[PDB]
Amino acid sequence: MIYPHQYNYIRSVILRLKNVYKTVNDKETVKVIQSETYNDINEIFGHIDDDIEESLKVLMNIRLSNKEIEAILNKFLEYVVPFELPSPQKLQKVFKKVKKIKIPQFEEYDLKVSSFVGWNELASNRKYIIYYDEKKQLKGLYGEISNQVVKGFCTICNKESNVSLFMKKKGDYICRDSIHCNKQLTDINQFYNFIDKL
C-alpha cells in the first residue's frame, strides 16, 4: 500500500524517464535516469514484487511505450489506497456550521490519486476541504473560493496553473479542482504546509 502523493511522484519520475528517452540522445545520461527511476521505485517499495520488477524492466528499456507506461501505472495504482470519504453524519460533525453540506461523488481512481478531498459550493462561492492529519483524525476546512480563475503558482500543489483565490486578510490562489491539485501534488507534507500557512 502506498500514499496517493507517492503514486503521483512515481508517475512523475516515469514521465521524466519517458521524456528522457524522447529528448536525451546519450545512452549514458539515459542510464543515470533509468537507475534514478529504479532507485525511486525501490524507495517507494521496500520489497518489490515480480510485477514491479517487470514494470521496472519495461521502464529500463529505452523503447518505452505510453501503453506500457499506462499498464505500469495501473499496476502501481492497485498498490495505492483511495482517500476515504467521511460518512454524511460524520461530515456533519466535521462541518456543524455548514447546513445541508453536499459532497460531489468522487471517482475511485480520483480518490486513489487524491491525498485530500475538497469541493466548492460555487453558489455560495465557498470551498469545503476534508483531509486526514498525521494523527489521522479527519480535518475539514470551509473557506470562500473566488469564482475567477487565473494561472498562478499554487501553494497546495506547489505548481503553477490556473487557480482560484481562496479566502478563509491574506489571499492565496488555489487550483479550482482539488483532484487536479492532488494530481499536481507530489507530497502530503506540502499540502500540510499549505494548511500550516493558512
Next chain:
RNA sequence: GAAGGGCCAUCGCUCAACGGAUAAAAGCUACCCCGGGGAUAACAGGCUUAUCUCCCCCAAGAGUUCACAUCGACGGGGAGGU
C-alpha cells in the same frame, strides 16, 4: 330624623388573550374513553418539480502542438417523474 339609595363629578383594571367568560385556576395519559373529520396530519395515489437523476448549448481551457480521442471552467437550455 337616620341608615341606606338616586343624580352629577371623579378614582380603583399589562381585565395587554386589550368587546374584558369567574373575585378566584397548572400539568400527564403508551391504562385510556366517547362524539365527530379525509373540513386535518402519518402510507399510497394526483398535481408540482425547488431538490434529484439523466441529456444537452457555448467552449475558457487540459490533452507535447491540437477545445471537441478523452475531459470540459464560468455560464445557458431541457427531459424524466425512481
